[PDB]
Every structure is written in C-alpha cells, then in structure tokens.
A and B are shown apart, each in its own frame.
Chain A
Amino acid sequence: GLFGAIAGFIENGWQGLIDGWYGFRHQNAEGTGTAADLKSTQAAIDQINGKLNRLIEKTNDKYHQIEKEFEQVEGRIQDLEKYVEDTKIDLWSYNAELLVALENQHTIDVTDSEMNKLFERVRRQLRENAEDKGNGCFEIFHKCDNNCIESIRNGTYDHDIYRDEAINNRFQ
C-alpha cells in the first residue's frame, strides 16, 4: 500500500486477533494481551461496505432488444447485429475489468491507511513518554499497568502523569 504499514513496517498480521481488523498487543510487568480497536476497524468496514453498495444494484432492466443467435448467415444486416452486440460486450467487459482493479487498488490503500492512522493516533497520545521501535511498536519508558494500557487503548491516557518518569528513563 501507499503508506507502507501493512506488508511494511508491520511485518505481518495477527491470526489471534479475531474480533477486529486492527488492534493492540502489549507487554508489561504483569503480562501480555491483544485487544481490537473498534474505531479503526469500523472505519475500514464502512468504507468497504460503501463500495459494495455502490456496486450491487444499478439498473440494467432490459426487455425487448435484438436477436443474438443465428442459424445461417444473411449478410449485411446480420453482420451489423452481431457487431453491435460484440462491441457492447467488449466495452462492458472492459468496464468490469477496470472497475475491480480500481476498487481493489483503492481498498488496499484504504486499509493500509487505516492501520497507519491508528499507529499515528497512538503515537500522538504517548507524547514524549515512548519511542517508536520501528515495527509498529512503542517502547514505553515508564511502568504501565493494565489500567495504564487500557487508558492508552480507550484514549484517556494522560501523558503528564508519567512524563517525569519517562523523560528520565529515556535520556539518563
């Protein structure tokens, strides 16, 4: 993708994460955990389902048209009829081919984008209390219990509470 997160600085996905498209995996003094991020997950699902709805249902309600099969050739008039249909099919085949290719290219970019938005959101939360390890992981430079981790995931983390402890660990 364009943002280089999925199949990028995140080396792979998590088969364990089964209740979301994106989430957090942590480790602290008391253990480890994986939890889904709903906002990012929902942001991607909504965008993809939007594509699905624009697609499924447009109006091709056709009744009386033209003959498309022939026993024997008749010449001029039959040639035109066949040529007309053959031209139609190639143009619609082309449209279907390009559409899927475009939609798919975009969908992959959107999902890569949503991964990166999540990473960036969390990066901004942590301020000077954490350092980017380079693999979609932050080293947190202060003791951070389960309530602390949950405060990061639910967006209530207050960096000022830990900043003194964090600055001192980072730089000395």
Chain B
Amino acid sequence: GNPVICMGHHAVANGTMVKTLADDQVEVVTAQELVESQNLPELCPSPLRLVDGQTCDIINGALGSPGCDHLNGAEWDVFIERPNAVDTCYPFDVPEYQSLRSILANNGKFEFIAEEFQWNTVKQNGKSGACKRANVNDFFNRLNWLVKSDGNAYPLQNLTKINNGDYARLYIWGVHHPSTDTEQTNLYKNNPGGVTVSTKTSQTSVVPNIGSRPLVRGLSSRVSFYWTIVEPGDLIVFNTIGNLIAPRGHYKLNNQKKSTILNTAIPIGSCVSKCHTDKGSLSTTKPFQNISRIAVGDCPRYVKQGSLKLATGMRNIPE
C-alpha cells in the first residue's frame, strides 16, 4: 500500500508585495492597486458640461467685460477658470470677492435679464479708455455709468424694482472712486457723493473714497462692485447723491445650485470622465487617488499615499 495523493495550491515565479496588520511586506500571487496615480493631460467635456472661461475669470464674465461675450447664456456643471485670465476694463475690486465668486460658480448659469431703469436728468452709458472692446471706448456691458447733466444737475435718484417673479434675482451694482476732489466735481456735482441700495430686509450704503492710488489701467480711479439678492416678494431701491455704477439688470438664480468652478490651465479634450482635477481629468475605477486634493465630480477620495495594494490572491510560495 503506497499510492500517494497530495493536496496543494498554485504559485507564480514572482508575486506582489502587500501590507497586512502584522507584516508590511507579504508576497501574494496577485494584487490590485487601489490608488490612482495617473491622470489625463486634458479635461473631459463629457458627460459633465464644462464651460471654458478662457480669458475671463468668472467675475469678469458676470460683469460683462470685453471678450466675455461667449459666456453669455452659458450653462455649466463646472466652470473652468484659467490662471492667465486678464483684466480688460476700467478696473475694480469686489469687497467680498471670494463670496461673490462662489455664488456665481455654484449658481451654474449666466442667464442675464434686461430691465430698464428710468434715471432722471443724469446721463447714461459712460465709457472709458481702459475698457475698450473692439477699437471703441466702452464699459462692462452689464453695467451703466451715469454721468452729469449738461446743466450740471444729478437729482437724488430713487427707482425701484419689484420681484414678482418665481425666482431670486441677483443685481450687481458698483460705486465709482475718484482720484481728486476735482475729478468728482467734474464727473459730477456733489462732494461727497454716495449710493444707498435697500431691500425690505436691508440697506447698504457707500460713500466714495478719493485719493492718490497707484497706476494700473492708466487712470487713478477705481470701481467697487457689490451685489444684492432679491427673493420673490422682495424689492430693491437705488438711492444716489452720486457715483453709482448702476445695473442694466439681474441674473437668474437657480433654486437648487449644484455647480462649481475649477481653476486650472489644463486644455479641454475628447475623453469621457465624470472626475476632474486641476491637473486634468481622472479615468479610473480605483477608490483612492494621490493626484490632487482639488477634485470635482464623481471622484476617488484623495489620500496621501502613492500606492495601496490589495491582495487578490493567496500568499506566493514558489518552487
């Protein structure tokens, strides 16, 4: 009696090292990498709607700067904002810059609504030498510069618009800041000037500052931009003893805001991927990624490790 039957298991010449609780270097027959460390050198326009701002950052696109006309009407899941965006107008500062930028990006669309404001004796459509769209002095096409009567007179102005629409409105208005006391009296009238924008709930007012400022743009004056949200059932009042960069309208606000902005210089390509990093899109089924903490869409979770191998086979013990 000497037949023999042996029970055994497979093995390969060379396996993969994995970690366990008790050993950080165990050789198993097969393993699967759980950390995506390769990205694409482009951004996928599908299935998410990516809108390329190109030369305009999202603030300049909303303002209506020269060269931002393509962004009109545009709807996006992700707004792609270039690091080499360039200011192309009479220039400015937004006091709560990040918060405005956030609201516009999250909102998801640039749907502008025209409405006409009956300004009194005061002019309209004032333009500038630092904001010139195709050859010809201009301004933010969503804003309207009011300047002096011919017989120098700017009455206190109050108009009012009422939101009986079924959506919340976003009005964007500005305040002009002159370099001199003469510049104000030139432009017009008063000294000081001032703007007070009210809603039922609120009332925001500004008095212009007047001083020697550096030379960007080639002027020493600047504009300060503000915004006001008007819910269905609310109103917005514009008061000016001077200097209002008045609005031509309001933007439409989605009830549900589900969009966002991604700032990167990566070109847009042909691929399909629901996951975008600032280094480019990701095309993976892995649960984790070490590529960038800036990640948007349907993405693996960002982790610090460059590799985490999951054993998909038994220990490898060859011979």
Nearest CB in chain B to that of A10: its residue: B8
- Point out the residue from A14, A68, A97, A103 that lies within 8 Å of B310, measured CB to CB: A103
Any B CB within 8 A of the CB of A42: no
Tell me whether B6 and A60 are in contact (CB under 8 A): no
Any B CB within 8 A of the CB of A89: yes
Any B CB within 8 A of the CB of A69: yes
Tell me whether A140 and B34 are in contact (CB under 8 A): no
Tell me whether A15 and B12 are in contact (CB under 8 A): yes
Complex Cα distance A62/B258, Å?
A: 10
Complex Cα distance A82/B210, Å?
A: 37
Any B CB within 8 A of the CB of A75: no
* Chain A, 115-172, CB within 8 A of any chain B CB: 115, 118-119, 122, 130, 133, 135-144, 149, 152, 165-166, 169-170
* Chain B, 152-209, CB within 8 A of any chain A CB: none
Tell me whether B314 and A44 are in contact (CB under 8 A): yes
Tell me whether B1 and A141 are in contact (CB under 8 A): yes
Any A CB within 8 A of the CB of B40: no
CB distance from B256 to the nearest CB of A (A): 11
Tell me whether A101 and B302 are in contact (CB under 8 A): no
Tell me whether A96 and B308 are in contact (CB under 8 A): yes
- Point out the residue from A14, A59, A137 that lies within 8 Å of B9, measured CB to CB: A14
- Point out the residue from B77, B294, B313 that lies within 8 Å of A48, measured CB to CB: B313
Any A CB within 8 A of the CB of B316: yes
Chain A contacts for B318, CB-based, 8 A: 12-13, 15
Complex Cα distance A149/B8, Å?
A: 15
Supposing A27-B4, A105-B22, A135-B6 touch, asked if A12 and B317 sit within 8 A by C-beta, the answer is yes
Chain B contacts for A10, CB-based, 8 A: 7-9
Tell me whether B310 and A92 are in contact (CB under 8 A): no
Chain B contacts for A152, CB-based, 8 A: 5
**Chain A 15-47 near chain B by CB (<8 Å), digits 1 or 0:** 101101111111111000000000000001000
What is the interface size of chain B, counting residues whose CB is below 8 A from a CB of the partner? 62
Any B CB within 8 A of the CB of A55: yes
Tell me whether B259 and A64 are in contact (CB under 8 A): yes
Any A CB within 8 A of the CB of B32: yes
Tell me whether B7 and A55 are in contact (CB under 8 A): no
Tell me whether B8 and A55 are in contact (CB under 8 A): no
Chain A contacts for B11, CB-based, 8 A: 12-15, 17
Nearest CB in chain B to that of A13: its residue: B11
- Point out the residue from A64, A89, A133, A166 that lies within 8 Å of B304, measured CB to CB: A89
* Chain A, 39-74, CB within 8 A of any chain B CB: 44, 48, 51-52, 55-65, 67-69
Any A CB within 8 A of the CB of B298: yes
Any A CB within 8 A of the CB of B129: no
Tell me whether B9 and A21 are in contact (CB under 8 A): yes
Complex Cα distance A119/B8, Å?
A: 8
Any A CB within 8 A of the CB of B118: no
Complex Cα distance A143/B1, Å?
A: 6
Tell me whether B301 and A63 are in contact (CB under 8 A): no
Supposing A108-B315, A111-B314, A136-B7 touch, asked if A96 and B303 sit within 8 A by C-beta, the answer is yes
- Point out the residue from A6, A133, A165 that lies within 8 Å of B4, measured CB to CB: A133
Complex Cα distance A89/B301, Å?
A: 9
Any B CB within 8 A of the CB of A80: no
CB distance from A125 to the nearest CB of B (A): 10
- Point out the residue from A15, A67, A112, A115 that lies within 8 Å of B7, measured CB to CB: A115
* Chain B, 261-319, CB within 8 A of any chain A CB: 285-288, 293-305, 308-319
Complex Cα distance A129/B22, Å?
A: 40
Tell me whether A93 and B5 are in contact (CB under 8 A): no
Question: What are 10 contact pairs spanning A and B, CB under 8 A?
Answer: A15-B12, A15-B318, A21-B10, A26-B5, A27-B4, A29-B3, A52-B32, A55-B34, A60-B299, A115-B7
Residues on A lying within 8 angstroms of B by beta carbon are 1, 6-7, 10-15, 17-18, 20-29, 44, 48, 51-52, 55-65, 67-69, 85, 89-90, 92-93, 96-97, 100-105, 107-108, 111-112, 115, 118-119, 122, 130, 133, 135-144, 149, 152, 165-166, 169-170
Residues on B lying within 8 angstroms of A by beta carbon are 1-13, 18-22, 26, 28, 32, 34-35, 77-78, 98, 102, 105-106, 257-260, 285-288, 293-305, 308-319
